Design a protein around this ligand. Sequence first.
Ligand code: MQ9
Ligand code: HEM
Ligand code: HEM
Lengths: 524, 524, 161, 166
Amino acid sequence: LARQAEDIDTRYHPSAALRRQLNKVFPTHWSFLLGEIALYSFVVLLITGVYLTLFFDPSMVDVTYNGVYQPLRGVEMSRAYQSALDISFEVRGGLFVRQIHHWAALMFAAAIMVHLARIFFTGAFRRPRETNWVIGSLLLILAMFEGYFGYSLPDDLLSGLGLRAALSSITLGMPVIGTWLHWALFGGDFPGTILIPRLYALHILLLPGIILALIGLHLALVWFQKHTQFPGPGRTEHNVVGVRVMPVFAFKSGAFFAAIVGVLGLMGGLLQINPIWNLGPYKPSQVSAGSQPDFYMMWTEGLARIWPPWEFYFWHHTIPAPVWVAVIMGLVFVLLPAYPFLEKRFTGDYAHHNLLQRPRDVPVRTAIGAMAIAFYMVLTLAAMNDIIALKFHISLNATTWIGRIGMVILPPFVYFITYRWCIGLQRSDRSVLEHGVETGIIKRLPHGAYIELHQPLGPVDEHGHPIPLQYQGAPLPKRMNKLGSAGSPGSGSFLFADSAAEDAALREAGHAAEQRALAALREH
Amino acid sequence: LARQAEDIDTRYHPSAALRRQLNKVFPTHWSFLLGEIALYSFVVLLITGVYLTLFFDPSMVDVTYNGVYQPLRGVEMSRAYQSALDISFEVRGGLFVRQIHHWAALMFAAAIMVHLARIFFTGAFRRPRETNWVIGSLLLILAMFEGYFGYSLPDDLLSGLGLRAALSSITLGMPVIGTWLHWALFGGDFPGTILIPRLYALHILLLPGIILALIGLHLALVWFQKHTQFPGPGRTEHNVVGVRVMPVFAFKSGAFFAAIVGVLGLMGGLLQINPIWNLGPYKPSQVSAGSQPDFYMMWTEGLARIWPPWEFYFWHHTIPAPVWVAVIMGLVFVLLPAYPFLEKRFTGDYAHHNLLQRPRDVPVRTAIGAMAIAFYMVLTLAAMNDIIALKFHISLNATTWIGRIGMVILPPFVYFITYRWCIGLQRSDRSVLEHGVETGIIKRLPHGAYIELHQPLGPVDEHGHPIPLQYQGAPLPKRMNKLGSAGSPGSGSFLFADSAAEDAALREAGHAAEQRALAALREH
Amino acid sequence: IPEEISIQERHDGASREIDRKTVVANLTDAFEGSTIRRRKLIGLSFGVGMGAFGLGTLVAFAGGLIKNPWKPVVPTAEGKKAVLWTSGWTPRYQGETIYLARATGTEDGPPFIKMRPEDMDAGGMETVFPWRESDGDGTTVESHHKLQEIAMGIRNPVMLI
Amino acid sequence: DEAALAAMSNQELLALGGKLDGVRIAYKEPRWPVEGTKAEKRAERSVAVWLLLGGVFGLALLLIFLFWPWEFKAADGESDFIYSLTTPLYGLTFGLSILSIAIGAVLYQKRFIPEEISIQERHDGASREIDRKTVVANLTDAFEGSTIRRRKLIGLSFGVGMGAFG
Ligand SMILES: CC(C)=CCC/C(C)=C\CC/C(C)=C/CC/C(C)=C/CC/C(C)=C/CC/C(C)=C\CC/C(C)=C\CC/C(C)=C\CC/C(C)=C\CC1=C(C)C(=O)c2ccccc2C1=O
Ligand code: HEM
Ligand code: HEM
């Protein structure tokens, strides 16, 4: 309406910051949506957690069930386990909501890891954006621990076993502080009466607030330090080529948000995750062959499984073996946010960067990243020792030793192969730059020679052979059909053709449009 | 350091927004800190609540105490009451922290009310700032309910009685929905098993998050719609006269924050508030003469106490008397945020305003506000009927009837007297404008006449009498000593004098400085 | 810290005309480049779809809390009645003896003891609860729970004078 | 510019706003230059069918949530098979509805909103020297006018007090 907008102007008068934000340009590359995936997962997590807080009681006081789930009637449980059973079986929609919540947590973790991979392999962490790299690393650690505290609130057998082992028994063994930290955290010995309410507070208020603040600072830095882009035709270290916010970018972002919510709803309805009733309440005397925390904590479990038992005994003291696991965990947590500074010190490159690198052009860093992913994958597979040995008929001792030896011999092999593979991709690019695109067509040349009929991308000499071009950090076409070569079928719908006049008109319009687009981007 | 600043500039390069935010001007009036008091008390509430969440268990399952407080050993209590007793008696500093928390809540409410009074009486809600008025009204309602939910978590006898009566019994009697709302909120009948955990979630996450978001929006609107000011020497509808942020305003704000923290710490350490151990755990059969919710909710209690018993009975239906209390509470909650629009459509003033009004120049609005304050004070005094009748020797029925009749007859009396008082203040201003400031010195005038020896504020005519001045919306002096008339004693410390040369130099320097300041603000 | 005075020059009111014109031109071009003004079927389809999704989602989000207050859940001597109509003084099997028991405050074996007419004077008041012999003293866990449920009832206490 | 900036068309006003913001539009072109063709009608129809499907599935979610038998009935006397479909049906209807709406929005963006290319002119690096000098002068004057440079007792006392309190 005109009156409302006129009054908003006469009262707050933005009208220039509004225009400035409406004309902000964003690049359109498929890999720049991986952070949006994590953002939308976090929004869904917020909504579903706010729902879940209206039904949960985080107490450890014991009760008898006497509920609807008959196979558990008469069993002594805690109040948290009974609250989770009530959410699952007596609130209309509660099982659906908590399954959506757990699936959203898993998608959150996976999206964060894929986004970290993109940033690392493209080099978007260099000089201007090192602080944003550090902020993202802190966000990753916080998300790990938030999910860990999350799936431990329904105090059932498997989560209680994971709690006991990891938290209690690794904190208790630390060299000097150790038991002091354990007792400050648990209020005493392991099964107390304050752990579940303390974790509930930490999980619904503290860590979510810190994560929200850090996400705000992260997105503000991304908004005000403009986005990076890949090298291309009209792209420069001084501009941003893409689309403006107002009509297109907001539309695409909202559509992607809706699609991600749809996927999460589908898989929270159709797939069962964490059926706590098949378990029981946690009890210190019972155990099962079940193990393996959520997949983002599996590498610590696998490290604890495959580390050798090296202990130290000196004067009335003891250093157990899980201290090694704690040390390696802290060493990873330290080395992750320090990589930009370590790399700039090693390479001696202190310049400003706005253009991205292709992973094939940085072979050493690509091989480092592949080695790290191989190490992570070995540790993650070592966590499912028993499941692997049961389903794929292998011995348990064999799986343990296989993990123990792979952890040391596989990453350098992956490094070597990744290095050679990147150099091979570079040589393929150079061949395509020197000759033309290979078309696949063979001739016979009446004196009996076979030729291949290349297709040049630039000017040719007087002898017909194309003139070689220079590499410019952009991808090169390898298939003839990806260039407009044999396309544009009939212009019907699927079963009945249109008229030939309409077909010809649409063809000419599209050709003119694409030609003017490429001209407008190449000439300026 | 210079190198860090150079790195910051090369990476984020603010250097213009930071200058715009260092050069922002803020006015200097003592009444402009009444919102800062509420802000700082909210910050203290956040910190102390975060501390308190580490020890509280909000469960309604019953246990036996067996603690340190002997006069309560062996008593059946809920888990929430037991955790409150633990915070009080078995954590080093817990009682101190929760008393600071409760005193900070009371200060928060009082400061919100005083700030609202200042806004209303100065008219800072006019055209450009009506949405700030509405946001503040919503903040007031949310703060009331957040505090009410806060002091009900330690499930003791007084808080249980208040919960029962107000929440349960007033919600249950609403005309058509009624019991449906009661059962949706409680999960069934009044004492359930989900009420205290639900209120704990509402109190530590939802309402604080909403209040934080609304306070952020409030402060952003105040920052970008610049502050108002009083009419004065060099003040205009188009400028802001005051001090810049950087050296002075931030320093004063930090000092005021520290002072408020100190006052709250002093009165949280030296004054005992809400000793829940003197009470017992809530039980539906016990009761005490204790009553009276926290002072910000006392007007609803007083309205319930003094409203007459008017009930309706028609075909198999009933409308009880507390429906009137509910209706009146909702009527107040609706009429509070609509006042700017009501006043503007009644007076016909639709213009922009940046200069404030003195409360004496707006007699009708000042009288309306005083009438509302009198109504609130009567309803608040009616809530302590029994305490007043015990301490001051009055009959209980007498106090009830006094409240019932005062509610009707006192506010119009206050209105009338306020109107006349405002006009009297205006006439005193006009007197000091037409003549000079009365000095208090009398002469005898040899023919036997007594004169008063006024002092003029402007130019004088031929007969020695000053010409009358025009009112300009600014206060006028009424005492001779407030103008520099007889001051600046010797310049020693307190018991020994300094040198005469130093004294004279300091005197002349001060006089020159004050005269240059007056000229610099008066001429331009 | 030295004393200062500063003036800021609000620059308030409506925005500059160039700012207003350019913002309006941006928004108008965005709205009329999409041709949405002449796709009534698409506008209607979007409206209907978003309305249906929003209504379904809100009903699903709010449906878990709503409970019927008048469903029969309390067993009595005449079937099952709704909570808000029963007390604990209601007979359960058509002739059961419900005593007026007084609370001892003690935790030894009885927290409720029976009363005889001569256990009171002509100026006494006593709070009494419904006893129902089958509850017994609170020695076992089941009887302890029954007595706790007696004591925690908002319509149980009775004044006997 | 000047008060006769009126009578200036929307295209020129949008170019002017972009030029003020530092943005430039290359190749903004309508999606359907040819007059009415059957392809455009088919595109509108395809965009509308997805939104109608989303509405249908939202209605289905509402009705299923309202009238499906949801209570726990698991046993093998009367094998239920009806209780075990409740959460699957919830998820199916909810996800299908919102995903159909998303697909419809994506198709509308891809086929009816015109395609553009915009350039932004970062203006990155260090700030303008005037901005740098002015901010540094502001901070330097704020620091040097306070005289704290020659109050060592006051500085040390403030440090000691704040450290003790903290
Ligand atoms: C680091 C980690 C990842 C490594 C591993 C660690 C571990 C393994 C993982 C985590 C595990 C566990 C153990 C971690 C525990 C973490 C724990 C729970 C942390 C919780 C966070 C913490 C304790 C909370 C307390 C701190 C907090 C509450 C205090 C901050 C205060 C808040 C945020 C500010 C609110 C006020 C705000 C809205 C207004 C700001 C003030 C504004 C800007 C100026 C005021 C102002 C304005 C704006 C005017 O316009 C104005 C106009 C005219 C006159 C005056 C004013 C005026 O004063
Ligand atoms: C931000 C990252 C978050 C992660 C990674 C996360 C993860 C999890 C996970 C995996 C569970 C176990 C689900 C299950 O029962 O199977 C859980 C439980 C829970 N979450 Fe979250 N959550 C997050 C945020 C939140 C927020 C913001 C809230 C509340 C506002 C919340 C409230 C809850 C509650 C109450 C439970 C226990 C209820 C139950 O287990 O059924 N969560 N969380
Ligand atoms: C923002 C406005 C707030 C108000 C008006 C408020 C008010 C109150 C009051 C009056 C009490 C009674 C304390 C007592 O006498 O024992 C209380 C209890 C409590 N509050 Fe707050 N509070 C606020 C914010 C918060 C926040 C942000 C948190 C947590 C992050 C919190 C956590 C608690 C806890 C855990 C209790 C119960 C512990 C106890 O009673 O000692 N409060 N609240």
